[PDB]
Design a protein around this ligand. Structure first.
Ligand SMILES: CN(C)c1cccc2c(S(=O)(=O)N[C@@H](CCCNC(N)=[NH2+])C(=O)N3CCCC[C@@H]3CCC(=O)c3nccs3)cccc12
Ligand code: NA
Ligand code: NA
Lengths: 9, 26, 248
C-alpha cells in the first residue's frame, strides 16, 4: 500500500 | 567525501550497532 | 531483511529504492555511489526465466527514504533513469555470475543529511576487510520472513569461508560471489529476503572510518534457512567494469 507519488514524477 | 554519513561520522556519533562490525575485524 | 531491526534515521544514506511506475511497487534495493550513478543487481532488471526485462521508462529511483510506503515529502528525492547498463557477461542462464548493473540518473541528485554516496572498495580495502568472520551490514525494505516492514531494516552478518559457501548448495559458485550468514551452530540468524535484491552489503573501514560497499544482495535459497547462506556480488572483482562504464 504505497502512498501516491507526485504526478510531476 | 564518500562513506562519511552527515548524521554520524560527520558529527562523530555512532549508530547503535556499528561497534559490532568493528569488534569482528581482528 | 529477516531478523533485522529498524534502521536509525540517516544510518544508510546511500540506500536507494527501485520503484515500479505501474503497478506501483518496490522492485529492489540499490545504492548511490555518486550524484548521478546507482548500483544494483542485474537480476532486478533482467531475469528472462520469469519474463522480467525492465527498461529505463519502467522505473523510478527513490533516494533518501526511511518509510517503505509513504511519499516522504521534503526528504526523499525521486529520479528518472537516463540509461541502464547490465554486465555483458551476467549469467542469468545458470548461476547469476556477474549479477551487477549500473543506472545513470537523468539529473544529479543533491546530497543532504539523508542522501550521501557510499565508497567503492580499493584492492587493499577489499584485501583487508573481505575475510571470513568479519561482519558487514545489509539493508532493505524486503520481506521479513520467507512480513513487510514499515521502515528500512538492517542486519549485520559475518562473511563465511568459501568452502562452507560451496558445500551449502548445488549451485556452481564463482570468484565473483561471496556468501554471508551465521551457521546453524551459531545462535544468531538473519538474511536478505525478497525485495532486498540489489541492496548494498557494506563494511566500515577501521583505518579511515569510511563505509565501503563490498557486496550487492544477489541470490539465496529461500531466506534465513539453517545451513544455507545469502550470496552477494563481489563488487571489487567487477570494479574494472564499473570504472570502464563511468569513464566511457
Ligand atoms: C538459478 N538461480 C538464479 C537461483 C539460485 C537460488 C535461488 C533461486 C531462486 S529462490 O527463489 O530460492 N531465492 C530468491 C530470493 C532470495 C532471497 N534471499 C536472499 N537473497 N538471501 C533468489 O535468489 N532470486 C535471485 C534470482 C531472481 C529471483 C529471486 C529474487 C526475487 C526477485 O527478484 C523478484 N522478482 C520477481 C519476483 S520476486 C529463484 C530463482 C533462481 C534461483
Ligand atoms: Na556444493
Ligand atoms: Na542461513
Amino acid at each position: 500500500d504505497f502512498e501516491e507519488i507526485p504526478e510531476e514524477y | 567525501d564518500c562513506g562519511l554519513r552527515p548524521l554520524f561520522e560527520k558529527k562523530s556519533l555512532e549508530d547503535k550497532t556499528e561497534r559490532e562490525l568493528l569488534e569482528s575485524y581482528i | 531483511i529477516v531478523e533485522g531491526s529498524d534502521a536509525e534515521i540517516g544510518m544508510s544514506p546511500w540506500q536507494v529504492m527501485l520503484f515500479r511506475k505501474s503497478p506501483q511497487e518496490l522492485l529492489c534495493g540499490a545504492s548511490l555511489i555518486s550524484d548521478r550513478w546507482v548500483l544494483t543487481a542485474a537480476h532486478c532488471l533482467l531475469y528472462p526465466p520469469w519474463d522480467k526485462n525492465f527498461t529505463e521508462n519502467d522505473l523510478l529511483v527513490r533516494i533518501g527514504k526511511h518509510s517503505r510506503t509513504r511519499y516522504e515529502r521534503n526528504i526523499e528525492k525521486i529520479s528518472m533513469l537516463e540509461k541502464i547498463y547490465i554486465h555483458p557477461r551476467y549469467n542469468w542462464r545458470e548461476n547469476l555470475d556477474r549479477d551487477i548493473a549500473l543506472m545513470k540518473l537523468k539529473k544529479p541528485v543533491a546530497f543532504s543529511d539523508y542522501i550521501h554516496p557510499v565508497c567503492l572498495p580499493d584492492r587493499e580495502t577489499a584485501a583487508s576487510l573481505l575475510q571470513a568472520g568479519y561482519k558487514g551490514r545489509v539493508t532493505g525494505w524486503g520481506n521479513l520472513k520467507e512480513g513487510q516492514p514499515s521502515v528500512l531494516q538492517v542486519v549485520n552478518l559475518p562473511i563465511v569461508e568459501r568452502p562452507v559457501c560451496k558445500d551449502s548448495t548445488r549451485i556452481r559458485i564463482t570468484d565473483n560471489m561471496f556468501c554471508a550468514g551465521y551457521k546453524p551452530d551459531e545462535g544468531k540468524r538473519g538474511d536478505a529476503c525478497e525485495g532486498d535484491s540489489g541492496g548494498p552489503f557494506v563494511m566500515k573501514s577501521p583505518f579511515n572510518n569510511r563505509w565501503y560497499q563490498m557486496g550487492i544482495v544477489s541470490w539465496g535459497e529461500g531466506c534465513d534457512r539453517d545451513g544455507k547462506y545469502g550470496f552477494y556480488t563481489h563488487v571489487f572483482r567487477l570494479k574494472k567494469w564499473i570504472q570502464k562504464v563511468i569513464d566511457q
